Each structure stands twice: as structure tokens, then as C-alpha cells.
């Protein structure tokens, strides 16, 4: 999706394999502010939020607890108490088009700032200064939404970046590559504790 209308998926009451993520080796960014990524698959969390969207390489900086800029204050805000993992990766071969990818958009001209975890979908004529347009696209009356120019010629900081931010909260645990059970032998075991 676009960073202004970012998708959010609630994950609860299912069984989660966190090993696929931490051990995939295809991510440009893997920074966890809650519990370390290698020790993420044993903490029974409640709801797992999956905030998926596409931004630029310089805009990955704004996806961090307490940041500023277009994305942070006008599109998607990561709270200062974020206890999850920001997972970003370049998608120049997927979301970039020769001539610019205008399918992806971002809110720039927004009145105030954004709240932690808030979808900004206010798509109405934005009066910049003090010019009444009553819904007319013009000077000091431009549209707040702005398109992107994702291209292979774009540099890393302007290249498309798929970012799934994993927010966490007693439904999802693991791990220790559960050793297959053995039978009939007096053994030492660890059965779910």
C-alpha cells in the first residue's frame, strides 16, 4: 500500500514462526526496540500488528521511535515506546517503473503533525495560506496527497522500499527447534516448561 493509507493486519490466536523472518537474509533493515530478534520466538504476545507500505530509502529513517519529516509527521508515525521490529528491504525490481511509479503516493501538506500509529486518509483540498477555494484545486488550495517517481534510475535514497513494521503486545510463542520426542527411555525433557 502507500505510506498514507498503510495496511494494518491483526495477528492473534495462530502459531507464529519468527525464524523465517530473522533468518531470511534479504532485508536492508532489521532493528528491534523491544526484545532482540534472535530471542523473539518465546515471548507469548497478544496482538501482532503488521504495518505494510512502500516508501523511499531516505524515508526509512522516519520509520523510527520519535522521528520527523514527511513520513513521520504526515503519513506513518512510529511511537517512542515502539516495542517491535522495523523490517525494511529495497524493491527497485518490484515497485519501480521506467518513467516513475505514480501508483504509490504520500501525504505532504497536512495541517498539524501525526499521532503514533494513525492512518492519514484526509484526501480533501488543502488550503495552504488563507485562500478560500471551497473545494477547488489551485494556488494555496493544492491537494495534500503527492505521487512518487520510483524509477530504476532513482538512487538508493529515492528507490522504492517495502517496509512491514511488526508491532507486538499470550497467543504466539516457541522455540528451541523443538527436539523430536523419544519413547520408553528414562530421559530428561522440557515439556512446554
Amino acid at each position, epitope marked *: 500500500a502507500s505510506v498514507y493509507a498503510w495496511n494494518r493486519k491483526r495477528i492473534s490466536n495462530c502459531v507464529a514462526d519468527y525464524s523465517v523472518l530473522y533468518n531470511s537474509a534479504s532485508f536492508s533493515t532489521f532493528k528491534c526496540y523491544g526484545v532482540s530478534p534472535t530471542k523473539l520466538n518465546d515471548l507469548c504476545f497478544t496482538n501482532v500488528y503488521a504495518d505494510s507500505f512502500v516508501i523511499r530509502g*531516505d524515508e526509512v529513517r522516519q520509520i523510527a521511535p520519535g522521528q*520527523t*519529516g*514527511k513520513i513521520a*509527521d*504526515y503519513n506513518y508515525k512510529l511511537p517512542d515506546d515502539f516495542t517491535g521490529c522495523v523490517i525494511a528491504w529495497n524493491s527497485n525490481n518490484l515497485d519501480s517503473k521506467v518513467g*516513475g511509479n505514480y501508483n504509490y503516493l504520500y501525504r*505532504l*501538506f*497536512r*495541517k*498539524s*503533525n*501525526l499521532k503514533p500509529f494513525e492512518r492519514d486518509i484526509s484526501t480533501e483540498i488543502y488550503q*495552504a*495560506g*488563507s*485562500t478560500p477555494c471551497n473545494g477547488v484545486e489551485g494556488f*494555496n488550495c*493544492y491537494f495534500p496527497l*503527492q505521487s512518487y*517517481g520510483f*524509477q530504476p*534510475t*532513482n*538512487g538508493v*535514497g*529515492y528507490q522504492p522500499y517495502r517496509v512491514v513494521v511488526l508491532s507486538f503486545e499470550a497467543t504466539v510463542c516457541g522455540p528451541k527447534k523443538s527436539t523430536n520426542l523419544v519413547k520408553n527411555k528414562c530421559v530428561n525433557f522440557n515439556f512446554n516448561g
Partner: antibody
Amino acid sequence: EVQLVESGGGLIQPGGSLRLSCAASGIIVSSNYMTWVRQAPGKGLEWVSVIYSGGSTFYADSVKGRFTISRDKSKNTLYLQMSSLRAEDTAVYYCARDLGPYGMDVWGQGTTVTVS
Amino acid sequence: IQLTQSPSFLSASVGDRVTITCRASQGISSDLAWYQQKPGKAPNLLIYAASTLQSGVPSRFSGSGSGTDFTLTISSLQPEDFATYYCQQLNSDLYTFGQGTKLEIK
């Protein structure tokens, strides 16, 4: 119609304090991106600062730790706290309105600041 | 990012076709604004988004290029078309300019 008028610069001893002002007619300063732009004598334009429409601030590497950008919603005015002034701060400053993909659509007349 | 205009001092007579080049070192492909500055005056937009004519600019001014290459094209010069011409990085964080090209009605 859309006019920016600037005051506050002047000849100031090195390391001293100073402040600029930039009154705005037509544009509301409190909801648009306003930037400070510098031009040393015999040199071109260069960026100084920007304060976001939400109130977030930004300064350049040559500016951090020295200047502060400030605003007033009652007078619709833009300010720049000028401090720790070295000799390289001798320049003319304009206030401009930032619109992202749209360029610096409106500009100010400029004020000359000299350090001695 | 580093923007380089080429070349700095430029000269032509009235009616000549001029091509002022601001060369993007990395490649950004839509983020250019053309800033014409009368000597000791306030600059003005000429072409924003590197190809579209900003409102009120006369139709003799054109822009072209996308990606790593960018150019300013003036179809027919005027005696008042002398200025210092700037290129700017749009959609940026430092809003990097070029050094400046001083066209001269020579």
C-alpha cells in the same frame, strides 16, 4: 499579494546574539513549511533551516548548535535566533515557503548581516 | 547529493538557442526546480518538476531531462534574459543547489 518582509539583521560583533524576523501577509506561517536560506557575498544560495507545518525543526550541519528557528501564530511571523556568530555568518538571508515538489514559490527581499 | 551546473560563464547574442545543464550526480528523475536570479535580486521559479512550465513564466522557457541528465533550454533569447540560473534538488532534506550559471547578453 503574497509578500514576505524581513528585519533584524545588522552589523554584530563575532560570537554575539541577534534575531531575524519575517512577517507574512496572505500565507499563514503556522501551517506551511518555512525555510531560511543564506547567501554569502560573492557566493550562491545555501540552505539554513526549515520548521515544519506541524512544528518540527531542522537546521544544516553548518548551523546545528548555533541558530534556532522560531515562530509566532499571533503575528504570523517567522524568527531565527542568531547566536555564536562567526565570520562565516556574514550573508544575506531570505525567508521562503517550501512545498516539496513545488519550488520556493514566494521569497523575501533579504537582509544583510555583517560580522565585525 | 552533489549538483553540478555546466558551464559557469555563458555568453550568447539575442535569438540564440541556449542549453544550460545542471547534471545530477546520483539520479533523482523528477526533483528539479530552475531558479533565475536577476543580479542582486529575488529568484523565481522557471520550470518545476524539471519539465513543466511554472505559471506566469513566458513560453520561451523550456526544461527537459529525467533521471541522471537534466537541462535548461531557452528557445529565443531576450536582452533581459541575462541572470544567474540555479538548479535545486526538490523533495530533499538539504535542498542542495548548484553553483550557478551566469548567462550574459553578450
